[PDB]
Design a protein around this ligand. Structure first.
Ligand SMILES: NC(=O)c1ccc[n+]([C@@H]2O[C@H](COP(=O)([O-])OP(=O)(O)OC[C@H]3O[C@@H](n4cnc5c(N)ncnc54)[C@H](OP(=O)(O)O)[C@@H]3O)[C@@H](O)[C@H]2O)c1
Ligand SMILES: NC(=O)c1ccc[n+]([C@@H]2O[C@H](COP(=O)([O-])OP(=O)(O)OC[C@H]3O[C@@H](n4cnc5c(N)ncnc54)[C@H](OP(=O)(O)O)[C@@H]3O)[C@@H](O)[C@H]2O)c1
Ligand SMILES: NC(=O)c1ccc[n+]([C@@H]2O[C@H](COP(=O)([O-])OP(=O)(O)OC[C@H]3O[C@@H](n4cnc5c(N)ncnc54)[C@H](OP(=O)(O)O)[C@@H]3O)[C@@H](O)[C@H]2O)c1
Ligand SMILES: NC(=O)c1ccc[n+]([C@@H]2O[C@H](COP(=O)([O-])OP(=O)(O)OC[C@H]3O[C@@H](n4cnc5c(N)ncnc54)[C@H](OP(=O)(O)O)[C@@H]3O)[C@@H](O)[C@H]2O)c1
Ligand SMILES: [Zn+2]
Ligand SMILES: [Zn+2]
Ligand SMILES: [Zn+2]
Ligand SMILES: [Zn+2]
Lengths: 358, 360, 360, 360
């Protein structure tokens, strides 16, 4: 069958909205409503990522992994039906001990055990028709969420990261002697989509949060943060210290390690940003000593499990029913598929750009 | 009252064996003398003026050295745990008031200095002196009569036990084990081949890991045969770099070496930073090294000191080891100095693994 | 100062809405009044003289009732957290000195009474009185101005939050989730249809469970609309006994009902014991009942009270629930009685879920 | 081909030492013979026909008995772990397909029969036969050569090691330790005085508990002496019941003894249900018993079987125990039988702790 789709030739690069031949084999058939894009989609189009590739036999890869889909047809089951809106899983499991319990996000082997829709050998979701198995679909249960549900994928990564935070913070009593997180200080390096999502969950877990960047911020972003009780600071003018939770979305060694030197005893550092091109920063013996004497834990986190998608939907609902303006304002452009230039340049004031599908 | 003691002037430096005046409380829970006291690089750095965070106890102009002690009880008030003549290992770190210190987890102090303090290091006299008074709660009883001087290894080993606790905690972030539930075939690499590295390596094997110590030069045949007695491999890494590492521990304190081995860590791997050296040269960590850590769900954890429970675990291990491999355990202690030989704080004996002081 | 307060004579019984002398205490940080106060079986059990463990404060001959409180700050010394006028829920359980109380986890007190004490229950005055003195630490600020009277539900919800904490701890003994990592179709059964049941059921739902409340009789259609509204089922187990349970929470305190539901619990099931009734008759647990528990690796966990942090989460859940289902959450508070109406303590408003007192 | 075996007709019962055909399957990784095989209450139950969940392997009329085994490798495919002549302990429980089985945690099978199977008990042949074929992954290598026959205690001891893992998981709900981080003075009581109670106590002591076994009659001086060597106490609870219990382990399966000891358990106390007996009579549990559990945040966890890692842990402890107290470990083995003495399944030669079969 012939259908419309946004494809790349991974890892060589390029993007075209075009026609392709997708035949059927499956438990469910779906179509897109919205599909977000992130740095990775752009990295794929730029040919900056060596780990991506087309599915076996084929010479293109359908882009798109941040999806909100609609069930057109479905097998016989007690969980979803025609008309239901769903978020598909990006990462699908291999055979390892972690994959086989639904924690492909903690895949013990890496590629080629696990695979990612739109990224590694699995067609993405920017195409008219999509076949899948029921278990790779997560039901949206809040009817008022609508398009905001497209933020699930970016948000699940945050929920897994926070899982990892909950795990490693058990090495000591991380809380105050009154049992709470009151006055505990979170700092998020960066002020884009992911940082925004980190900051909001942080707020829900009870931290005082403060996003940060190497420049002032738009009045758009500034107001959003205030709406969620989230501070901001240009670190070139006012450097925070005494940090209990450091989360990095920059990927820049120089910036990560300068903030690490502000981390409190028993502080946790979450590394989350890719930046393969970031310049090297010289980590010295004094830096190591600082980490050791303070029992600091630095943890890299990638992707997440199905359960985290569920958690993410629930949080989007709650935040939507309390600050709907600010949540809507996360999405900063909605785009036609033909508008393939969004993969090459960042619109003005972008936070999250999405593609509205016809 | 007047006693002999080995002292310094922290943080300035220097060392001397000498007479000093110390209080002689009539009221105390326990009164002890030292039998053996270990030295480590912190002692040597104290004495060389290399450590700036060390200080003398309030209103005093010396600091008695020594935090690795094996002591004997001279006298003690009625209690259910220890009595005159028993051997004990004293806690180094003493609790402040924070949430962690109040539960006996000062090793995880939330403030740092000056909430917690360490014997012979920060604001509290150490154990190289004729007489020592303490509370019972701060003493760990050696329950193995056969251990003798081996028990002086309790302090450097408890650091290892806490570090492995850190490992147990953080490795709960995914299934670390094989699909048969075990650690069989999991690979531990320990940067360094000194006494801390030996102790890490041995606990590693007890935990079921395949273990290899590594250094930037070949090792003595004695060390080699020690490693070989315990099933521990060695590798001069300039001739063959270990790869595919599940648990990596560093005792060097050296960035270049740390980050070089990080790049060989598997998915879900754990890196423990334990060593430190403030003089260590910088190493450029780039975006590529960050990504590597991220995409692998790697955890990098600093670990310092340990809790009293780790002292008990340490003693149990030293005893298990000694009753299996008595010789190689004895060979950890490579020199028994007298307190007059204060040059051991300056010059390392030849073939040093662990040097100790046999107190008069 | 003379003030209005409803009091009792712990443990013996009875209640008056009367004046009492409430002096200004020697040291305190905040002065407060009540806005609303919830009531539960325990208050009704104190009035009936049905609790041997309660007692009046030291020296005094009366106990102010009321532990389920919403309060307003009349005055408070300057701090970063609360201002005059703010609304707060006060902690019921106050810390002693054990290793758990000193960290803010007096809910897990290691000693029991007299280490911890509970406002309105165990040597401490409850909140049904015109003026209240307290420290800031023991107050939980409402940060959602929309919540209003719903915030008086924080106390009963707090207990449920702790219990889900206990479930998250003990359920780590094995993989409780499906092989997709979720709880989809895991079955929670709650014994009971009272206020605590509903609160368990709603949290159950936020955790991903399929939830069914149960009882030995049908339920009023106000209850069935609330249930249906949150997606919670109901079943009368005399006509339809649920089977195959993954999480069983009892709010009844009735042995025989407990142990008959335990026999429907699956491998790796968790049983939370929460409700209590000292009057309930004995069910004869036999060799098989135990065998059933053992072979399935079931965990039966008793849970009492909660920590401050759980008050904070309780308040956050109510906020979420209120902005999603404002009417069903409002529908929980079935009566706003007056201090004067000291009959509530004795009789139950017809089809009560939660009875509150609007304080003048 | 023809081999000797001891067999039952599960679940009917009976026992016989006889000849069976054992074909050499097409492909296998390992061929083994038994050296020693232990017997437990389960074997006696099987033979007695008292266990209705037991069954022969599909389309066979008999079931080879025996799950506590120590075997030697006759032949194995080349691999890096074991080789011919190596001694091993084979896994009793073999995995099915559920989320726990597939990660090597069949001991926590989410389904039970017939997902998981158990050698000698459920549809898989046991170890009392001349020849046994297995896969490597299912064998746990004995690394200490001095152990000898003592290594046959692995299987009963791995049950204990998993139950201590359950304890470690559940006791995270609060601070279970003293405020010095230790288990000093924490009280362990173990109901029963048989093989399992002894191994529970020894582990108990290694974890730092004060341990007391209890039974409802005095014990032979063989047993008492052994307790004494490991610093474990005993009490006939008819005469004297321990109180103030922090960890309670039951090996009786008897409700009345269980619940009577539950009412001695401290706040944050843990109870392990492990013993089972379907013939044990009912004992009334009332509202006030439930209430006692609730108010103390007690946890009651049933535990069955263990994972492969727990077999490896068991072997490590048996070594540690053997090099400290060789004579006393040997004494746990109280009778060595020849295969023709099938009497041991019906009558337990008195003074019994562990009866074993030496395979000729
Ligand atoms: N680990 C995972 O599972 C996973 C999954 C998806 C994406 N990611 C990564 O997560 C990162 C963040 O996602 P995103 O969608 O938020 O990306 P984004 O929208 O491009 O935002 C990146 C943020 O980092 C800021 N930044 C760059 N250099 C900085 C510095 N020196 N100091 C402070 N801030 C700095 C950027 O600011 P300006 O734009 O204002 O310069 C921007 O705010 C991306 O790098 C992506 O690689 C990770
Ligand atoms: N966190 C804590 O609780 C704690 C407590 C005490 C001490 N420490 C630290 O732990 C470290 C080790 O303790 P230790 O007593 O075992 O001291 P040590 O014997 O001096 O150990 C240092 C080891 O590291 C080796 N090394 C140095 N640079 C290296 C490199 N680039 N590559 C590989 N190996 C290298 C040394 O070899 P050579 O001798 O051949 O150069 C030596 O084997 C010290 O740094 C100390 O500062 C930490
Ligand atoms: N652990 C703690 O920290 C804590 C704190 C506060 C309260 N509690 C206990 O929590 C329990 C519930 O609190 P609550 O405020 O919800 O009181 P509640 O409204 O009385 O709830 C009790 C529920 O149990 C039902 N029930 C009684 N007997 C039953 C049986 N045999 N089978 C099935 N269901 C039965 C009742 O139904 P009917 O009304 O139809 O009889 C009622 O729905 C009380 O026992 C209280 O003592 C515990
Ligand atoms: N994974 C599991 O959950 C698992 C695995 C294997 C075995 N088991 C069970 O674990 C138990 C122990 O194993 P074992 O091999 O040690 O069996 P065992 O030697 O028969 O031990 C049972 C002990 O309980 C004592 N006893 C019986 N009734 C008692 C009572 N009312 N009060 C106090 N003590 C009482 C017995 O005393 P006398 O012998 O002097 O009567 C004996 O010491 C058995 O019940 C068996 O069913 C469980
Ligand atoms: Zn995998
Ligand atoms: Zn502290
Ligand atoms: Zn307490
Ligand atoms: Zn299974």
């Amino acid at each position: 069958s012939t259908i419309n789709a946004i494809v790349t030739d991974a890892p060589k690069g390029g993007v075209k909205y075009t026609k392709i031949d997708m035949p059927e084999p499956y438990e469910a058939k779906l179509k897109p409503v919205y599909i977000g894009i992130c740095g990775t989609d752009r990295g794929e189009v730029a040919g900056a990522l060596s780990f991506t590739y087309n599915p076996e036999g084929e010479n293109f890869l359908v882009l798109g992994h941040e999806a909100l889909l609609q069930v057109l047809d479905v097998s016989d089951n007690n969980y979803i039906k025609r008309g239901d809106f769903v978020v598909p899983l990006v990462r699908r499991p291999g055979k390892c001990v972690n994959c086989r319990i639904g924690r492909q996000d903690n895949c013990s082997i890496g590629d080629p055990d696990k695979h990612e829709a739109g990224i590694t050998g699995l067609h993405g979701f920017m195409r008219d028709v999509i076949y899948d198995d029921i278990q790779n679909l997560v039901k949206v249960n809040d009817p008022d969420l609508g398009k905001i549900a497209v933020l699930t994928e970016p948000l699940k990564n945050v929920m897994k990261a926070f899982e990892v935070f909950d795990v490693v913070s058990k090495r000591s009593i991380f809380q105050n002697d009154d049992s709470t997180f009151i006055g505990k200080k979170m700092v998020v390096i960066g002020s884009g989509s992911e940082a925004f999502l980190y900051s909001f969950v942080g707020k829900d877990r009870g931290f005082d949060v403060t996003m940060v960047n190497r420049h002032d911020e738009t009045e758009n972003k500034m107001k959003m943060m205030d709406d969620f009780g989230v501070g901001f600071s240009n670190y070139l003018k006012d450097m925070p210290d005494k940090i209990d939770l450091l989360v990095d979305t920059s990927g820049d060694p120089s910036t990560i390690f300068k903030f690490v030197k502000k981390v409190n005893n028993n502080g946790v550092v979450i590394l989350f940003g890719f930046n393969g091109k970031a310049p090297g920063y010289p980590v010295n013996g004094e830096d190591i000593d600082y980490i050791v004497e303070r029992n600091i834990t630095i943890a890299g986190s990638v992707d997440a499990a199905k359960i985290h998608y569920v958690q993410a939907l629930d949080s989007l609902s709650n935040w939507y029913h309390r600050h709907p303006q600010t949540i809507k304002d996360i999405i900063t452009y909605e785009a036609k598929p033909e508008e393939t230039n969004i993969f090459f340049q960042k619109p003005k004031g972008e936070i999250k750009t999405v593609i509205k599908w016809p």
